[PDB]
Amino acid sequence: DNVLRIATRQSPLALWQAHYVKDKLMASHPGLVVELVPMVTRGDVGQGLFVKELEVALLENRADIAVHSMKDVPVEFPQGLGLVTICEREDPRDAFVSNNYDSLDALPAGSIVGTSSLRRQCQLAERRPDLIIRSLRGNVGTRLSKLDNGEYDAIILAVAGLKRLGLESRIRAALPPEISLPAVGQGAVGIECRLDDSRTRELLAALNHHETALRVTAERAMNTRLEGGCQVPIGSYAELIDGEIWLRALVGAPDGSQIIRGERRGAPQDAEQMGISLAEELLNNGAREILAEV
Ligand SMILES: *Cc1[nH]c(Cc2[nH]cc(CCC(=O)O)c2CC(=O)O)c(CCC(=O)O)c1CC(=O)O
C-alpha cells in the first residue's frame, strides 16, 4: 500500500502534532506517503470528547493512525484499537500565564484565574483560597484571547502547548510539579491504531521513546485503576530518577480542603503494578468518596 493516513483534530496545536509525527515518519521512511485526515470532535463543539470520532475513523478504515496529546487519551479502548506509540516527552509542567502579574503569589485576593481543570483548581485553592477560579474553555488561542480581553487575571496552561505554538513568551512562570502535579502524560503525544495492523505498527516503532513510555505507563496504570479522565481532580506524574520510576499522584476536592497524596518508587519493569498499587492506596485513604462526590 505504502500510504499512511493520519486522523487528527483541526485546531492549530492538533495540526502541529500531526506534522510533528508526519515528519518523524518521513525521516525514518523517505518514500512513505503520509496523508492528513483532519476532523472535529465533540469537545470542540463514552468520554470521547476529543477522541471518539478519531476512533470511529480508525474502525472504518478512514485513517490508519490517530494522534493525541497523551492526557486526552481515554483509559478504555474499543475492541480493536489501542495506544501503541508514545513520543518523546516535552515539558510536562503547567504554566502561569498573565499580562499584569509576574507570579501566583503576586496576585491580590480576588484575582480571577482561569481553568476548567479540577486538578489545577484543587491545588490552587489549597494554597490560595482567596483566589477566584473561573472556568475557561476553547483552544489555546481562544484562551489567550480571553485573558487579553481582561476576562481573567491569569490562566493556567501546559508549558508543552505554548512552547510548540511558538508562544513561549506567554509563559510567565513554569510551575514546579510539587506546586501543580501534572495531568497524566502532559507533554507527550500518543499514537493510536488498530492492534491487528502489524504493517502500521512496525512503521510506528521508530517513533517510540522508551523512557517516556515507562513514565506514562505508570502514570496511566494509576489513572486506569482510578478510572478517571480530564473531568476528575487527579494528578499523576512520574520521573526516571536514577534508574527508578518515581511516581507521585493526588486526588483532591475542588475547594482544596482535602487533598490525598501518595507516592511510589520502583524498577521500571514494575511501572504498571506500582501505579495500580498507588491508586488503591489513594482509594482506601478517602479518594473513593471524594471522586464519588464529583
Ligand atoms: C485532559 C485535559 N485536557 C485539557 C485540554 C488540553 N489538552 C491538551 C492541551 C495542551 C497541552 C498538552 O499537549 O498536554 C490542553 C490545554 C492545556 O492544558 O494547555 C485539560 C485542561 C482543561 C483546562 O485547564 O481548562 C485537561 C485536564 C487537565 O489538564 O487536568
Side-chain angles (χ1 to χ4, degrees), residues 236-282:
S236 180
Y237 178 65
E239 297 195 311
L240 240 310
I241 308 300
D242 297 316
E244 282 180 278
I245 294 288
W246 180 30
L247 176 64
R248 271 177 290 179
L250 72 73
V251 177
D255 57 10
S257 57
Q258 192 185 18
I259 295 195
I260 307 304
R261 294 190 169 73
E263 65 179 284
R264 200 63 96 248
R265 198 176 311 227
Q269 318 88 257
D270 297 294
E272 195 182 31
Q273 287 301 297
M274 80 168 86
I276 279 167
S277 302
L278 179 54
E280 299 195 291
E281 184 187 292
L282 293 202

mmCIF file of all heavy atoms in Angstrom, residues 236-282:
data_model
loop_
_atom_site.group_PDB
_atom_site.id
_atom_site.type_symbol
_atom_site.label_atom_id
_atom_site.label_comp_id
_atom_site.label_asym_id
_atom_site.label_seq_id
_atom_site.Cartn_x
_atom_site.Cartn_y
_atom_site.Cartn_z
ATOM 1 N N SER A 236 -1.069 12.989 38.399
ATOM 2 C CA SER A 236 -0.328 11.750 38.193
ATOM 3 C C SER A 236 0.884 12.057 37.323
ATOM 4 O O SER A 236 0.769 12.276 36.113
ATOM 5 C CB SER A 236 -1.225 10.698 37.527
ATOM 6 O OG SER A 236 -0.536 9.478 37.301
ATOM 7 N N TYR A 237 2.053 12.045 37.955
ATOM 8 C CA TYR A 237 3.306 12.376 37.297
ATOM 9 C C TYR A 237 4.447 11.476 37.762
ATOM 10 O O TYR A 237 4.687 11.334 38.961
ATOM 11 C CB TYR A 237 3.627 13.849 37.593
ATOM 12 C CG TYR A 237 4.936 14.341 37.028
ATOM 13 C CD1 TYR A 237 5.145 14.407 35.648
ATOM 14 C CD2 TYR A 237 5.970 14.756 37.876
ATOM 15 C CE1 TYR A 237 6.356 14.877 35.120
ATOM 16 C CE2 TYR A 237 7.183 15.230 37.362
ATOM 17 C CZ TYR A 237 7.367 15.283 35.982
ATOM 18 O OH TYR A 237 8.560 15.723 35.468
ATOM 19 N N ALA A 238 5.192 10.949 36.797
ATOM 20 C CA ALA A 238 6.311 10.056 37.050
ATOM 21 C C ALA A 238 7.583 10.548 36.387
ATOM 22 O O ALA A 238 7.538 11.132 35.305
ATOM 23 C CB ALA A 238 5.990 8.653 36.549
ATOM 24 N N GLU A 239 8.709 10.294 37.053
ATOM 25 C CA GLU A 239 10.041 10.658 36.575
ATOM 26 C C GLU A 239 11.001 9.476 36.706
ATOM 27 O O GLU A 239 10.760 8.558 37.488
ATOM 28 C CB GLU A 239 10.596 11.840 37.358
ATOM 29 C CG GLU A 239 9.792 13.107 37.204
ATOM 30 C CD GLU A 239 10.554 14.326 37.672
ATOM 31 O OE1 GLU A 239 11.113 14.287 38.787
ATOM 32 O OE2 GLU A 239 10.603 15.323 36.925
ATOM 33 N N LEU A 240 12.066 9.501 35.914
ATOM 34 C CA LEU A 240 13.088 8.458 35.912
ATOM 35 C C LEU A 240 14.249 8.958 36.771
ATOM 36 O O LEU A 240 15.182 9.589 36.268
ATOM 37 C CB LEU A 240 13.601 8.229 34.488
ATOM 38 C CG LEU A 240 13.465 6.861 33.826
ATOM 39 C CD1 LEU A 240 13.978 5.785 34.756
ATOM 40 C CD2 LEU A 240 12.020 6.596 33.455
ATOM 41 N N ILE A 241 14.187 8.676 38.066
ATOM 42 C CA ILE A 241 15.220 9.100 38.998
ATOM 43 C C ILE A 241 16.216 7.978 39.293
ATOM 44 O O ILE A 241 15.895 7.021 39.999
ATOM 45 C CB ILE A 241 14.581 9.581 40.319
ATOM 46 C CG1 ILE A 241 13.505 10.632 40.038
ATOM 47 C CG2 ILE A 241 15.627 10.162 41.244
ATOM 48 C CD1 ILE A 241 14.014 11.861 39.345
ATOM 49 N N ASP A 242 17.421 8.101 38.740
ATOM 50 C CA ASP A 242 18.485 7.117 38.947
ATOM 51 C C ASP A 242 18.068 5.678 38.655
ATOM 52 O O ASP A 242 18.240 4.787 39.490
ATOM 53 C CB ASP A 242 19.018 7.204 40.382
ATOM 54 C CG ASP A 242 19.657 8.550 40.689
ATOM 55 O OD1 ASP A 242 20.431 9.066 39.840
ATOM 56 O OD2 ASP A 242 19.387 9.092 41.788
ATOM 57 N N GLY A 243 17.578 5.439 37.442
ATOM 58 C CA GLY A 243 17.167 4.097 37.069
ATOM 59 C C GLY A 243 15.920 3.573 37.767
ATOM 60 O O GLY A 243 15.685 2.373 37.761
ATOM 61 N N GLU A 244 15.128 4.456 38.369
ATOM 62 C CA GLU A 244 13.893 4.066 39.058
ATOM 63 C C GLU A 244 12.749 5.022 38.745
ATOM 64 O O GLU A 244 12.959 6.236 38.642
ATOM 65 C CB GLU A 244 14.079 4.075 40.574
ATOM 66 C CG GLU A 244 14.813 2.887 41.160
ATOM 67 C CD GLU A 244 14.949 3.006 42.668
ATOM 68 O OE1 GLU A 244 15.868 3.713 43.135
ATOM 69 O OE2 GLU A 244 14.125 2.406 43.388
ATOM 70 N N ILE A 245 11.544 4.478 38.600
ATOM 71 C CA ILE A 245 10.374 5.305 38.349
ATOM 72 C C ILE A 245 9.905 5.863 39.691
ATOM 73 O O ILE A 245 9.711 5.117 40.653
ATOM 74 C CB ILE A 245 9.196 4.494 37.768
ATOM 75 C CG1 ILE A 245 9.524 3.972 36.378
ATOM 76 C CG2 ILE A 245 7.934 5.354 37.717
ATOM 77 C CD1 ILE A 245 9.532 5.060 35.315
ATOM 78 N N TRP A 246 9.820 7.176 39.790
ATOM 79 C CA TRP A 246 9.312 7.779 40.998
ATOM 80 C C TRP A 246 7.936 8.313 40.619
ATOM 81 O O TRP A 246 7.820 9.279 39.862
ATOM 82 C CB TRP A 246 10.208 8.907 41.473
ATOM 83 C CG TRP A 246 9.686 9.544 42.718
ATOM 84 C CD1 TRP A 246 8.955 8.942 43.706
ATOM 85 C CD2 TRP A 246 9.821 10.923 43.095
ATOM 86 N NE1 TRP A 246 8.618 9.864 44.668
ATOM 87 C CE2 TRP A 246 9.133 11.081 44.319
ATOM 88 C CE3 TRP A 246 10.451 12.030 42.512
ATOM 89 C CZ2 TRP A 246 9.059 12.321 44.977
ATOM 90 C CZ3 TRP A 246 10.377 13.259 43.164
ATOM 91 C CH2 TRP A 246 9.681 13.394 44.386
ATOM 92 N N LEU A 247 6.900 7.608 41.051
ATOM 93 C CA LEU A 247 5.541 8.011 40.755
ATOM 94 C C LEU A 247 4.887 8.774 41.906
ATOM 95 O O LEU A 247 4.978 8.374 43.074
ATOM 96 C CB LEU A 247 4.703 6.785 40.376
ATOM 97 C CG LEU A 247 3.210 6.993 40.107
ATOM 98 C CD1 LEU A 247 2.986 7.887 38.887
ATOM 99 C CD2 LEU A 247 2.564 5.646 39.911
ATOM 100 N N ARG A 248 4.223 9.872 41.560
ATOM 101 C CA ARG A 248 3.513 10.712 42.515
ATOM 102 C C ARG A 248 2.099 10.885 41.983
ATOM 103 O O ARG A 248 1.869 10.824 40.771
ATOM 104 C CB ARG A 248 4.181 12.076 42.641
ATOM 105 C CG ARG A 248 5.268 12.169 43.698
ATOM 106 C CD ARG A 248 5.902 13.541 43.692
ATOM 107 N NE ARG A 248 6.713 13.740 42.493
ATOM 108 C CZ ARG A 248 7.372 14.859 42.215
ATOM 109 N NH1 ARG A 248 7.314 15.891 43.047
ATOM 110 N NH2 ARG A 248 8.123 14.931 41.125
ATOM 111 N N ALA A 249 1.146 11.083 42.885
ATOM 112 C CA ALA A 249 -0.247 11.244 42.491
ATOM 113 C C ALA A 249 -1.063 11.925 43.576
ATOM 114 O O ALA A 249 -0.632 11.994 44.724
ATOM 115 C CB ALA A 249 -0.856 9.879 42.163
ATOM 116 N N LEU A 250 -2.233 12.432 43.207
ATOM 117 C CA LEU A 250 -3.127 13.079 44.162
ATOM 118 C C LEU A 250 -4.559 13.083 43.665
ATOM 119 O O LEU A 250 -4.813 12.881 42.482
ATOM 120 C CB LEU A 250 -2.687 14.521 44.486
ATOM 121 C CG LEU A 250 -2.784 15.730 43.542
ATOM 122 C CD1 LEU A 250 -4.235 16.214 43.370
ATOM 123 C CD2 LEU A 250 -1.958 16.858 44.144
ATOM 124 N N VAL A 251 -5.491 13.232 44.597
ATOM 125 C CA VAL A 251 -6.908 13.317 44.284
ATOM 126 C C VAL A 251 -7.407 14.334 45.296
ATOM 127 O O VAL A 251 -7.195 14.160 46.490
ATOM 128 C CB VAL A 251 -7.632 11.981 44.489
ATOM 129 C CG1 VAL A 251 -9.115 12.156 44.216
ATOM 130 C CG2 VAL A 251 -7.063 10.918 43.567
ATOM 131 N N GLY A 252 -8.019 15.416 44.833
ATOM 132 C CA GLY A 252 -8.471 16.422 45.768
ATOM 133 C C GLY A 252 -9.831 17.018 45.516
ATOM 134 O O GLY A 252 -10.383 16.909 44.430
ATOM 135 N N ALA A 253 -10.397 17.615 46.556
ATOM 136 C CA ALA A 253 -11.695 18.257 46.450
ATOM 137 C C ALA A 253 -11.486 19.569 45.710
ATOM 138 O O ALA A 253 -10.462 20.229 45.889
ATOM 139 C CB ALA A 253 -12.266 18.524 47.837
ATOM 140 N N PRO A 254 -12.468 19.976 44.891
ATOM 141 C CA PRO A 254 -12.419 21.217 44.108
ATOM 142 C C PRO A 254 -12.085 22.448 44.951
ATOM 143 O O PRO A 254 -11.341 23.326 44.517
ATOM 144 C CB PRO A 254 -13.830 21.299 43.541
ATOM 145 C CG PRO A 254 -14.173 19.859 43.322
ATOM 146 C CD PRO A 254 -13.699 19.224 44.603
ATOM 147 N N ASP A 255 -12.616 22.480 46.170
ATOM 148 C CA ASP A 255 -12.390 23.582 47.101
ATOM 149 C C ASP A 255 -11.001 23.560 47.764
ATOM 150 O O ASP A 255 -10.655 24.455 48.540
ATOM 151 C CB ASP A 255 -13.512 23.631 48.156
ATOM 152 C CG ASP A 255 -13.661 22.324 48.943
ATOM 153 O OD1 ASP A 255 -12.792 21.433 48.833
ATOM 154 O OD2 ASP A 255 -14.665 22.187 49.678
ATOM 155 N N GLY A 256 -10.240 22.503 47.497
ATOM 156 C CA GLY A 256 -8.898 22.377 48.047
ATOM 157 C C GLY A 256 -8.786 22.061 49.532
ATOM 158 O O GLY A 256 -7.699 22.176 50.113
ATOM 159 N N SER A 257 -9.901 21.691 50.160
ATOM 160 C CA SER A 257 -9.893 21.358 51.580
ATOM 161 C C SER A 257 -9.145 20.047 51.822
ATOM 162 O O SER A 257 -8.163 20.011 52.566
ATOM 163 C CB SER A 257 -11.317 21.273 52.134
ATOM 164 O OG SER A 257 -12.099 20.334 51.424
ATOM 165 N N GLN A 258 -9.582 18.980 51.166
ATOM 166 C CA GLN A 258 -8.928 17.702 51.340
ATOM 167 C C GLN A 258 -8.250 17.220 50.066
ATOM 168 O O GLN A 258 -8.889 17.051 49.033
ATOM 169 C CB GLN A 258 -9.926 16.652 51.825
ATOM 170 C CG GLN A 258 -9.255 15.372 52.301
ATOM 171 C CD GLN A 258 -10.244 14.284 52.663
ATOM 172 O OE1 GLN A 258 -11.409 14.325 52.269
ATOM 173 N NE2 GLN A 258 -9.779 13.297 53.421
ATOM 174 N N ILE A 259 -6.945 17.016 50.145
ATOM 175 C CA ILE A 259 -6.184 16.525 49.015
ATOM 176 C C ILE A 259 -5.436 15.301 49.495
ATOM 177 O O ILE A 259 -4.737 15.354 50.509
ATOM 178 C CB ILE A 259 -5.186 17.570 48.488
ATOM 179 C CG1 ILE A 259 -5.944 18.776 47.916
ATOM 180 C CG2 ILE A 259 -4.280 16.950 47.415
ATOM 181 C CD1 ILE A 259 -5.082 19.679 47.075
ATOM 182 N N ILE A 260 -5.620 14.195 48.786
ATOM 183 C CA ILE A 260 -4.981 12.922 49.119
ATOM 184 C C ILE A 260 -3.737 12.748 48.243
ATOM 185 O O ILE A 260 -3.838 12.685 47.020
ATOM 186 C CB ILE A 260 -5.942 11.728 48.857
ATOM 187 C CG1 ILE A 260 -7.273 11.952 49.566
ATOM 188 C CG2 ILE A 260 -5.333 10.444 49.357
ATOM 189 C CD1 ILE A 260 -7.133 12.193 51.062
ATOM 190 N N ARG A 261 -2.570 12.660 48.867
ATOM 191 C CA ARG A 261 -1.334 12.496 48.122
ATOM 192 C C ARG A 261 -0.732 11.126 48.396
ATOM 193 O O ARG A 261 -0.975 10.525 49.443
ATOM 194 C CB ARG A 261 -0.318 13.586 48.502
ATOM 195 C CG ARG A 261 -0.707 15.010 48.121
ATOM 196 C CD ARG A 261 0.439 15.992 48.310
ATOM 197 N NE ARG A 261 0.150 17.295 47.712
ATOM 198 C CZ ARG A 261 -0.705 18.187 48.215
ATOM 199 N NH1 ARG A 261 -1.365 17.938 49.340
ATOM 200 N NH2 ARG A 261 -0.923 19.329 47.572
ATOM 201 N N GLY A 262 0.077 10.642 47.464
ATOM 202 C CA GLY A 262 0.717 9.351 47.629
ATOM 203 C C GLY A 262 1.874 9.272 46.657
ATOM 204 O O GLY A 262 1.910 10.041 45.698
ATOM 205 N N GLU A 263 2.836 8.391 46.918
ATOM 206 C CA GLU A 263 3.991 8.226 46.037
ATOM 207 C C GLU A 263 4.477 6.783 46.035
ATOM 208 O O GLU A 263 4.150 6.009 46.944
ATOM 209 C CB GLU A 263 5.127 9.163 46.443
ATOM 210 C CG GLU A 263 5.735 8.887 47.799
ATOM 211 C CD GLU A 263 6.859 9.837 48.091
ATOM 212 O OE1 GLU A 263 7.948 9.649 47.516
ATOM 213 O OE2 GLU A 263 6.649 10.791 48.865
ATOM 214 N N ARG A 264 5.238 6.415 45.011
ATOM 215 C CA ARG A 264 5.738 5.058 44.894
ATOM 216 C C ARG A 264 7.038 5.124 44.109
ATOM 217 O O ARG A 264 7.219 6.026 43.294
ATOM 218 C CB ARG A 264 4.693 4.209 44.161
ATOM 219 C CG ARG A 264 4.794 2.702 44.355
ATOM 220 C CD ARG A 264 4.579 2.260 45.803
ATOM 221 N NE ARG A 264 3.212 1.831 46.107
ATOM 222 C CZ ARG A 264 2.382 2.499 46.910
ATOM 223 N NH1 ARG A 264 2.775 3.638 47.478
ATOM 224 N NH2 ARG A 264 1.181 2.005 47.200
ATOM 225 N N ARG A 265 7.978 4.235 44.422
ATOM 226 C CA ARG A 265 9.259 4.192 43.719
ATOM 227 C C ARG A 265 9.677 2.752 43.481
ATOM 228 O O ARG A 265 9.589 1.928 44.384
ATOM 229 C CB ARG A 265 10.347 4.924 44.500
ATOM 230 C CG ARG A 265 11.539 5.264 43.635
ATOM 231 C CD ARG A 265 12.585 6.067 44.387
ATOM 232 N NE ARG A 265 12.029 7.208 45.119
ATOM 233 C CZ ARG A 265 12.527 8.443 45.088
ATOM 234 N NH1 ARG A 265 13.588 8.729 44.341
ATOM 235 N NH2 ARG A 265 12.005 9.382 45.872
ATOM 236 N N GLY A 266 10.081 2.440 42.253
ATOM 237 C CA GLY A 266 10.495 1.087 41.943
ATOM 238 C C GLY A 266 11.156 0.940 40.590
ATOM 239 O O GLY A 266 11.330 1.912 39.866
ATOM 240 N N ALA A 267 11.530 -0.289 40.255
ATOM 241 C CA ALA A 267 12.186 -0.590 38.990
ATOM 242 C C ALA A 267 11.226 -0.366 37.839
ATOM 243 O O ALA A 267 10.032 -0.640 37.949
ATOM 244 C CB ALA A 267 12.688 -2.026 38.989
ATOM 245 N N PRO A 268 11.740 0.118 36.706
ATOM 246 C CA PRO A 268 10.937 0.386 35.511
ATOM 247 C C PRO A 268 9.982 -0.737 35.114
ATOM 248 O O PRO A 268 8.819 -0.496 34.787
ATOM 249 C CB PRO A 268 12.007 0.652 34.458
ATOM 250 C CG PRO A 268 13.014 1.430 35.255
ATOM 251 C CD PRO A 268 13.129 0.570 36.506
ATOM 252 N N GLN A 269 10.450 -1.970 35.224
ATOM 253 C CA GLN A 269 9.636 -3.122 34.866
ATOM 254 C C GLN A 269 8.319 -3.220 35.628
ATOM 255 O O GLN A 269 7.367 -3.824 35.137
ATOM 256 C CB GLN A 269 10.423 -4.415 35.067
ATOM 257 C CG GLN A 269 11.868 -4.358 34.588
ATOM 258 C CD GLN A 269 12.809 -3.837 35.664
ATOM 259 O OE1 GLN A 269 13.242 -2.685 35.629
ATOM 260 N NE2 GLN A 269 13.105 -4.682 36.641
ATOM 261 N N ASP A 270 8.246 -2.629 36.815
ATOM 262 C CA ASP A 270 7.023 -2.707 37.614
ATOM 263 C C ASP A 270 6.173 -1.442 37.555
ATOM 264 O O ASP A 270 5.371 -1.184 38.464
ATOM 265 C CB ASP A 270 7.354 -3.029 39.079
ATOM 266 C CG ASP A 270 8.021 -4.386 39.249
ATOM 267 O OD1 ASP A 270 7.358 -5.416 38.992
ATOM 268 O OD2 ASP A 270 9.206 -4.417 39.649
ATOM 269 N N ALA A 271 6.314 -0.685 36.470
ATOM 270 C CA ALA A 271 5.571 0.561 36.287
ATOM 271 C C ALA A 271 4.051 0.425 36.426
ATOM 272 O O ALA A 271 3.424 1.143 37.218
ATOM 273 C CB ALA A 271 5.930 1.193 34.947
ATOM 274 N N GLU A 272 3.473 -0.526 35.700
ATOM 275 C CA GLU A 272 2.032 -0.751 35.725
ATOM 276 C C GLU A 272 1.521 -1.147 37.104
ATOM 277 O O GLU A 272 0.508 -0.624 37.573
ATOM 278 C CB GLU A 272 1.654 -1.816 34.703
ATOM 279 C CG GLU A 272 0.170 -1.896 34.378
ATOM 280 C CD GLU A 272 -0.145 -3.011 33.398
ATOM 281 O OE1 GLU A 272 0.569 -4.045 33.415
ATOM 282 O OE2 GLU A 272 -1.102 -2.859 32.606
ATOM 283 N N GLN A 273 2.212 -2.070 37.762
ATOM 284 C CA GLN A 273 1.780 -2.507 39.087
ATOM 285 C C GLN A 273 1.955 -1.456 40.177
ATOM 286 O O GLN A 273 1.091 -1.332 41.043
ATOM 287 C CB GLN A 273 2.430 -3.834 39.484
ATOM 288 C CG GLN A 273 1.864 -5.055 38.719
ATOM 289 C CD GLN A 273 0.354 -5.261 38.906
ATOM 290 O OE1 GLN A 273 -0.127 -5.507 40.019
ATOM 291 N NE2 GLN A 273 -0.393 -5.170 37.807
ATOM 292 N N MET A 274 3.032 -0.674 40.127
ATOM 293 C CA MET A 274 3.221 0.355 41.140
ATOM 294 C C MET A 274 2.164 1.439 41.004
ATOM 295 O O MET A 274 1.732 2.029 41.997
ATOM 296 C CB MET A 274 4.629 0.949 41.103
ATOM 297 C CG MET A 274 4.911 1.993 40.041
ATOM 298 S SD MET A 274 6.505 2.820 40.407
ATOM 299 C CE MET A 274 7.658 1.697 39.601
ATOM 300 N N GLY A 275 1.724 1.668 39.771
ATOM 301 C CA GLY A 275 0.699 2.662 39.519
ATOM 302 C C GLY A 275 -0.615 2.146 40.049
ATOM 303 O O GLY A 275 -1.405 2.889 40.635
ATOM 304 N N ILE A 276 -0.841 0.854 39.851
ATOM 305 C CA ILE A 276 -2.051 0.196 40.327
ATOM 306 C C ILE A 276 -2.079 0.179 41.862
ATOM 307 O O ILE A 276 -3.122 0.427 42.471
ATOM 308 C CB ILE A 276 -2.178 -1.232 39.705
ATOM 309 C CG1 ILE A 276 -2.749 -1.123 38.281
ATOM 310 C CG2 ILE A 276 -3.064 -2.137 40.550
ATOM 311 C CD1 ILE A 276 -2.645 -2.397 37.450
ATOM 312 N N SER A 277 -0.926 -0.041 42.487
ATOM 313 C CA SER A 277 -0.835 -0.069 43.952
ATOM 314 C C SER A 277 -1.082 1.314 44.541
ATOM 315 O O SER A 277 -1.822 1.467 45.519
ATOM 316 C CB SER A 277 0.541 -0.560 44.400
ATOM 317 O OG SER A 277 0.813 -1.850 43.891
ATOM 318 N N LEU A 278 -0.470 2.324 43.938
ATOM 319 C CA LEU A 278 -0.627 3.677 44.430
ATOM 320 C C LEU A 278 -2.100 4.086 44.374
ATOM 321 O O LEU A 278 -2.652 4.616 45.345
ATOM 322 C CB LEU A 278 0.246 4.632 43.621
ATOM 323 C CG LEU A 278 0.150 6.107 44.020
ATOM 324 C CD1 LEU A 278 0.422 6.219 45.504
ATOM 325 C CD2 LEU A 278 1.123 6.956 43.194
ATOM 326 N N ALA A 279 -2.747 3.780 43.256
ATOM 327 C CA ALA A 279 -4.154 4.113 43.060
ATOM 328 C C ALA A 279 -5.029 3.537 44.170
ATOM 329 O O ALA A 279 -5.942 4.202 44.672
ATOM 330 C CB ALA A 279 -4.624 3.593 41.705
ATOM 331 N N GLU A 280 -4.765 2.287 44.533
ATOM 332 C CA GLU A 280 -5.543 1.620 45.569
ATOM 333 C C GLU A 280 -5.291 2.216 46.954
ATOM 334 O O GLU A 280 -6.209 2.295 47.775
ATOM 335 C CB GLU A 280 -5.288 0.115 45.544
ATOM 336 C CG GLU A 280 -5.676 -0.537 44.215
ATOM 337 C CD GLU A 280 -5.773 -2.045 44.304
ATOM 338 O OE1 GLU A 280 -4.725 -2.707 44.462
ATOM 339 O OE2 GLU A 280 -6.904 -2.566 44.201
ATOM 340 N N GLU A 281 -4.059 2.664 47.198
ATOM 341 C CA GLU A 281 -3.704 3.301 48.462
ATOM 342 C C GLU A 281 -4.551 4.571 48.556
ATOM 343 O O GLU A 281 -5.180 4.824 49.579
ATOM 344 C CB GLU A 281 -2.211 3.652 48.497
ATOM 345 C CG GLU A 281 -1.709 4.232 49.823
ATOM 346 C CD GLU A 281 -0.264 4.725 49.754
ATOM 347 O OE1 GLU A 281 0.656 3.895 49.617
ATOM 348 O OE2 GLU A 281 -0.046 5.951 49.847
ATOM 349 N N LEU A 282 -4.608 5.348 47.474
ATOM 350 C CA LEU A 282 -5.416 6.571 47.480
ATOM 351 C C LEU A 282 -6.895 6.243 47.702
ATOM 352 O O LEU A 282 -7.574 6.906 48.493
ATOM 353 C CB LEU A 282 -5.230 7.395 46.196
ATOM 354 C CG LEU A 282 -3.853 8.040 45.964
ATOM 355 C CD1 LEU A 282 -3.967 9.210 44.996
ATOM 356 C CD2 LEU A 282 -3.300 8.538 47.266
#
